[PDB]
């Protein structure tokens, strides 16, 4: 319950909208109770008065009651639905912005995955349920009971506290008792659901293997056995909800029976209550509608609390990179220099690898050539400041990289990643990402000059990409990454394995695209492919995280070192 505190704090924005929804929920319930109680009293009072009491009996004042209660009940219900749904969409928007704003500063390393993010989206959806599914019914039930108890004690304190006491006692005791009674079943239920999903994913992914080896029929048999156990846990959970719905009817029965019995003896000082008996029994009949959502509301608090812990576990991680507030001016020419920084992870070498310490002058293209299958390259991550370098120092234009504020750092470095992401938006939005303000024609000429003509053939810039449609192939998807880096127009360009997974035709076109477009920019290109390296001013070949040798493609072959062996087809 302490876990919900940060999400409860999010309710300060739109506090009036959220509280109006609960107030309208209370007013609708009180109008339902007041309308039935007034009708029950009116029948008794008029029946007792009889025909002889027509002239003495006042009915104008009850007439305003049944008119007022009927209007405030139908208008209360309509606006309770409208206001509480509108408020539920407001809190979802603020939950999504809050979660995204927390996840952004800890983006690369904090999140470590596609199953995690589907679970993060579903958890945010569950925190959105806390208001209508949990808070609105529980708070609305409490105030209705208190208003009924207080208002009904002007007649008799003993009767009001008996009906109000029974309703308060079931409001506070029964939901925790049923939440506790089904906690054992709700754990076997989560275990059996995750076990079924694991056996289903293994049965679907290994369908080729299972069918070939003749095991596809007996691995579906244990899948159906898990489903049977899973459905037996769901049946046990339904029998608990069956009990709580039956017990709710008996508690409502007890209140009516007690009011029929106790109020018959006397209401207030009047030992002959008459019409006042029907006032109490009809209040008891109507009052238990307020408690209908309550046990189901407290059950859902268990799901909401689980999601709140799970989201807080993710968004409360410490960001491992901090950015100053200095308003540095981005230079038009970037000269990157490195000192004692590692190119790749330790890779279980346990040799305490020394730094690389290379130097990149402004305007020069340098390719870092590293063995395939070795430790994964990490120079891209610590140049975009995914994490700080634990050893050595990275200077960007003879100034430390940590001295750049985020706005300047992202504007002085444009990177084409190995994993290029297609956002679901239109083709124009997938390119306006790189440069936010760009002319529609300056945007289209980029698509022409990178060789993406097919993307302007019919739907053009408005064509929907991503999951909506128009999946891009690996070759043309690489030209999308380069188009963004060209639009970004940063002085330093970082290419990570750009020609990987490409045919010789596409690989040659993209390499030529790099040279002519990125002539005036420093590129630090990291590949394990020998193609097109004659254009680079400097080639750095390294084995086991150490520069074995370095030089231009001409003089590097003359030394007949490790690079010459690669050119031999070794």
């Amino acid at each position: 319950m302490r876990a919900l505190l940060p999400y409860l704090a999010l309710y300060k924005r739109h506090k009036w909208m959220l509280s109006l929804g609960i107030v309208l929920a209370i007013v609708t319930l009180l109008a339902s109770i007041g309308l039935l109680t007034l009708s029950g009293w009116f029948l008794s009072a008029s029946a007792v008065a009889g025909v002889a009491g027509l002239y003495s009996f006042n009915y104008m004042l009850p007439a305003a009651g049944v008119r007022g209660a009927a209007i405030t009940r139908t208008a209360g219900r309509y606006f309770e639905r409208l206001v509480s749904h509108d408020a539920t969409f407001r809190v979802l928007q603020h939950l999504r912005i809050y979660t995204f704003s927390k996840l952004l500063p800890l983006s690369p390393a904090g999140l470590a995955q596609g199953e995690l993010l589907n679970r993060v989206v579903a958890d945010v959806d569950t925190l959105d349920h806390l208001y209508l599914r949990v808070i609105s019914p529980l708070v609305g039930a409490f105030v209705v009971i208190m208003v009924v108890t207080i208002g009904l004690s002007f007649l008799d304190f003993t009767l009001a506290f008996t009906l109000g006491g029974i309703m308060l006692l079931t409001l506070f005791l029964m939901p925790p008792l049923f939440y506790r009674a089904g906690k054992s079943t709700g754990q076997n239920l989560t275990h059996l659901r995750g076990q079924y999903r694991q056996q289903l994913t293994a049965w679907l992914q290994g369908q080729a293997e299972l069918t070939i080896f003749g095991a596809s029929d007996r691995y579906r048999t244990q899948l159906e056995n898990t489903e049977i156990q899973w459905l037996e846990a769901q049946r046990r959970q339904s029998e608990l909800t069956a009990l709580s719905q039956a017990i709710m009817l008996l508690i409502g029965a007890l209140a009516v029976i007690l009011m029929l019995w106790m109020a018959s003896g006397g209401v207030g000082g009047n030992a002959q209550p008459g019409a006042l008996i029907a006032l109490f029994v009809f209040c008891a009949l109507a009052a238990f509608e307020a408690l209908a959502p309550v046990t189901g509301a407290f059950q859902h608090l268990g799901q909401v609390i689980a999601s709140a812990v799970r989201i807080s576990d993710l968004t409360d991680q410490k960001p491992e990179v901090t950015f100053p507030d200095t308003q540095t001016r981005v230079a038009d020419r970037v000269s990157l220099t490195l000192r004692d920084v590692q190119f790749t992870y330790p890779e279980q070498s346990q040799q305490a690898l020394k730094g690389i310490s290379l130097q990149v002058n402004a305007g020069e293209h340098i390719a870092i050539l590293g063995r395939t299958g070795c430790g994964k390259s990490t120079l891209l991550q610590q140049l975009t400041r995914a994490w700080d370098p634990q050893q050595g120092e990275i200077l960007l234009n003879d100034s430390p990289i940590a001295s750049l504020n985020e706005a300047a750092l992202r504007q002085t470095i444009s990177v084409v990643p190995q994993r290029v992401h297609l956002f679901s938006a239109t083709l124009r939005d997938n390119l306006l990402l790189a440069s936010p303000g760009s002319s529609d024609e300056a945007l289209s000429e980029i698509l022409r000059r990178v060789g993406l003509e097919k993307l302007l053939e019919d739907a053009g810039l408005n064509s929907w990409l991503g999951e909506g449609g128009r999946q891009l192939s690996g070759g043309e998807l690489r030209r999308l990454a380069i188009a963004r880096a060209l639009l970004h127009d940063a002085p330093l360009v970082l290419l990570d394995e750009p020609t990987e997974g490409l045919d010789a035709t596409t690989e040659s076109q993209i390499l030529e695209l790099l040279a002519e477009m990125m002539r005036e920019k420093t590129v630090l290109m990291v590949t394990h492919r020998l193609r097109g390296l004659s254009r680079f001013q400097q080639i750095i070949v390294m084995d086991n995280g150490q520069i074995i040798e370095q030089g231009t493609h001409a003089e590097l072959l003359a030394r007949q070192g490790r690079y010459y062996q690669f050119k031999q087809g070794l």
């Binding site: 007792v48 309509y78 989206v121 293994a202 769901q234 069956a242 039956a246 009809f282």
Partner: protein, 587 residues
Amino acid sequence: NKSRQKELTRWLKQQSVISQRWLNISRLLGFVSGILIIAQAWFMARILQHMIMENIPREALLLPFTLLVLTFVLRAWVVWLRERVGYHAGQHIRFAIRRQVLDRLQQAGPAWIQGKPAGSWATLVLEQIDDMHDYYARYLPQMALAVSVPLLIVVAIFPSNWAAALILLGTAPLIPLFMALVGMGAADANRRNFLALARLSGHFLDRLRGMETLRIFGRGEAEIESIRSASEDFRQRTMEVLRLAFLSSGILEFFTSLSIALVAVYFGFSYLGELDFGHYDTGVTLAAGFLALILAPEFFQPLRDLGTFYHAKAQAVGAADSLKTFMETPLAHPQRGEAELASTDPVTIEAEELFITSPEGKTLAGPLNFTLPAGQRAVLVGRSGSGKSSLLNALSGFLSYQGSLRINGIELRDLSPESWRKHLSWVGQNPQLPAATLRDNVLLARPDASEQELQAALDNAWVSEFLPLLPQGVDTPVGDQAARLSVGQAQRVAVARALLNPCSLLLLDEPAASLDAHSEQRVMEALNAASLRQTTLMVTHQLEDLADWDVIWVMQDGRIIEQGRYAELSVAGGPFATLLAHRQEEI
């Protein structure tokens, strides 16, 4: 009639006949609920009249109080029974739909299964089939209760006072009259709001999956505004529809309030003497007035509770949208014969004018005209997306084909899949270890294998060299998606599984594509030897070590464009030399 909302609602009721026995019991028990509600109201009305009018002390009314307690206890018993019966109706429908979905998904085969991520099949099978439960467990029983209890109330009130019965019956035709005006078009508009909500959820998931790209471009702050604009656009669009959709709630609350007030006003002024109609010229009693008052909110309660179940129906219609189209997509389904392959000797694959077809009807490989003699090993090479992998899936029986593909002069169509696949061993990239322990995974090929045979397989595949590194050794749990084992040693387990039983045909689909430098050296070493025992077909881009393979097929755009041994192709200057040169540019 022709809306998608009604089409999906008809589909949901077509599936409900699986548990029609349960839905009939539930509808029968709802009729018992109505009778007990009336017996409740009749006893309370009689007790109230005695105490209020005849002033009978509560100690003289033990018989009516006792009967009132039993009818309360019986009501709670029926509510308990209906809730349990309701679950059974939902469970036996979900169990049957899940069986149909898994039947259609096993029978479509791995060719169709890999068209989607396995987490999206888990959404269909777990989440969306389970989203249909409350519609069958709660919504459909409540629909039956909403037309049985109210009519049974009217039948009970009508003999006592026809004016009171008219007040309740008068409001009955107006609620369906509203459905024609609003709420038939609003229901389908809401179905699109739930689609827009799910699409807005995928908009947010898209921004989460692309935070790495948003970070490097510094677009995080400008992507909060896209989240805010999209959410704001959804809310305004949805709230326009809900201003009409929530009119059903208010109108039902108006007609329940009007009916209670009208019953109160009619009876109250009848007692005062103002009115003299509706009471069957016998006289209006307080017991008659109380019976109609207690039963007036009960007349509308089944309809009011049906709006409490709106979301049970809304999420079943959303689930039916995905499950109806899944069950209706036509699929290729390669046809299975009855013939059996008599011999256990290496087969002679022959193909002429062979076209391979995807499960959706697309052609994956064009005209194939190859021939592979018994005991010979061949390699498929070519640019990614040229249909090399499709030929191995056709031979496995996973794909239908238009042409000729004869195994020993017998068409692959006519071969019974169960008998054909016992002559088939396959090692592919991305190994799949479905079993629990590493010994179960290796022994999956044939559990009857002896320990001596199993140890030979674990030795030839070089599995035993990393067994000491494992905690439990050979009987080690492999974990979810082979988490314990790295891809290099998981693939060696697949090699052990393949060579556990020598076969007639061995298909290898880039076995050592993404393995480390060491496992690749041991996976290939085992497969280099295995490929000599029987007919082998291997798909690679590791062209530098194909000298010993006696046939090489260069595939481009779904057809074989070159053939011959390594010595001829490497110098012929054809497409293989281009591919070989491209391969050599790797380090």
